[PDB]
Design a protein around this ligand. Sequence first.
Ligand SMILES: CC(=O)N[C@H](CCCCNC(=O)CSCCNC(=O)CCNC(=O)[C@H](O)C(C)(C)COP(=O)(O)OP(=O)(O)OC[C@H]1O[C@@H](n2cnc3c(N)ncnc32)[C@H](O)[C@@H]1OP(=O)(O)O)C(N)=O
Ligand SMILES: [Zn+2]
Ligand SMILES: [Zn+2]
Ligand SMILES: [Zn+2]
Ligand SMILES: [Zn+2]
Ligand SMILES: [Zn+2]
Length: 534
Amino acid sequence: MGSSQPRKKIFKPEELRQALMPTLEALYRQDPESLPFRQPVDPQLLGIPDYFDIVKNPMDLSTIKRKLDTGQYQEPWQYVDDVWLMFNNAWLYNRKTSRVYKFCSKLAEVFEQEIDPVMQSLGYCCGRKYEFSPQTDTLDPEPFVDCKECGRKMHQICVLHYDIIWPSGFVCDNCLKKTGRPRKENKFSAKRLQTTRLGNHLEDRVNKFLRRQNHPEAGEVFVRVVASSDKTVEVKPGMKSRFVDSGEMSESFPYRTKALFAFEEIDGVDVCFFGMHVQEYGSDCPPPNTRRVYISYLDSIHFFRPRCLRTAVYHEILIGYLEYVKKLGYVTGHIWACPPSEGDDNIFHCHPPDQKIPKPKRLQEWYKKMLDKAFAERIINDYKDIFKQANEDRLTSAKELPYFEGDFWPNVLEESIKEKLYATMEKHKEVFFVIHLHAGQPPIVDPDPLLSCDLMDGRDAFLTLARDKHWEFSSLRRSKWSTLCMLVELHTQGQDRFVYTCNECKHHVETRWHCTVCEDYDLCINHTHKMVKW
Ligand SMILES: CC(=O)N[C@H](CCCCNC(=O)CSCCNC(=O)CCNC(=O)[C@H](O)C(C)(C)COP(=O)(O)OP(=O)(O)OC[C@H]1O[C@@H](n2cnc3c(N)ncnc32)[C@H](O)[C@@H]1OP(=O)(O)O)C(N)=O
Ligand SMILES: [Zn+2]
Ligand SMILES: [Zn+2]
Ligand SMILES: [Zn+2]
Ligand SMILES: [Zn+2]
Ligand SMILES: [Zn+2]
């Protein structure tokens, strides 16, 4: 039952009383807001019988003062926890409209204002009591990591320590500077993730843009394709009995799905801010889907450091994609511009509450804004809504409009099972976009291999994992931890197991040479660049 920290930091009652008293004093200094808290709550004075059936562990400034004065706190966190218990009791019994609730919120704002730097000066991260967002009476706490050398407990998310990266345990920032050796660099980074021709093109597109701007807060951006696989869309049994039972359209359609993410350095750490799953139907795919792409899902977390260039870099990513698929041989883009349902996430588990979900018109206008700039850039020849293309290119049969996986139309055709379908086309005409890469020969060849990654094969896997692991994207601090964890998941959970080969030799070798300039220059001496003995 007993533990052993020989060099553990203990605070004498007067050392913590010296440091924690200013913070408690600042609360008492707030008149009249601290007045219903300066003494314990009295249900007989207030006519509130049910108080002790709601608040089970009462707390108030006076009890916290008595504990502080008579040294009943051994380490700061017991003080910190008791104030938040008093605050949490007020937010509980008193309604959000209440004066006491507002009074409590003011005290809490001043507690946050003072407690953070005092805890920081005493070798801690912050003085806040954190909890995870509710899922599905009782909430989940934030994890803590105890310093190996000093024993000081810290919020795991504050300090960004994950064991799988640093297995020698966690040692606090100041302990490392007492020895004179800085922390061991995180190798599970976005920059280190497997480079792909597509991702490189997209990150060049955004890095050249912000290089031209030279914005102060702007951090380096990394776009990586984390999963790439060959999937198949099977035609639904309804439309299958009308066109597949004959020979008008194929029973299935081949596409390559690719999940891809965008990351940026914020305070020297990787923060993920953009997600996107696409469907690419190649040259050997039967009609209608031949040579077309389809943005299946897209998501974002608004913590992009220079908040001004935020939508400029989202648009530059979306435009770099179209410049890429077009260049290698695709002809039409397809976006179902629909926002997510209330309280539902596309890719990133827990969105920030202060992050505004655009209205369907705003989303259409945002996509519209992106496409016009790409037209001027001479990437997209032209674009039109689904109705202005089914009547310009003359469509009369169901088999003529593209059939994508999880798209609206493949499921709406199944609804017309008892019977007007061209009438549904102009109702939602602004939602569906048809992009033209070419106006009007050799087959497509994706140079990139296939990234096998179960977590990014479909949105559901990453969304469910983060939900169980509590990897939220609700705060910048919480997004930094969720990115830290998702990067180790993509690294360690790497389903692809490599077999390296040399370039000029073309042999499967174990001992090799790798220069510090090219992307993957492996060579067998059995070139101008300086090689490394790997
Ligand atoms: C059956 C079924 O399940 N069916 C489903 C159907 C799924 C359909 C398939 N979906 C797709 O294919 C994807 S199309 C896009 C989907 N939506 C999303 O990506 C999620 C929303 N979040 C975002 O990623 C971003 O908002 C983004 C779209 C990237 C635009 O970035 P932004 O930078 O432009 O921000 P803003 O929020 O638009 O607005 C930018 C400004 O507008 C402000 N703003 C935004 N919305 C509002 C608003 N509501 N009220 C007031 N202001 C508002 C915001 O505060 C801000 O201001 P500031 O510049 O001062 O900061 C199924 N199959 O699963
Ligand atoms: Zn903390
Ligand atoms: Zn320490
Ligand atoms: Zn700006
Ligand atoms: Zn060789
Ligand atoms: Zn080289």
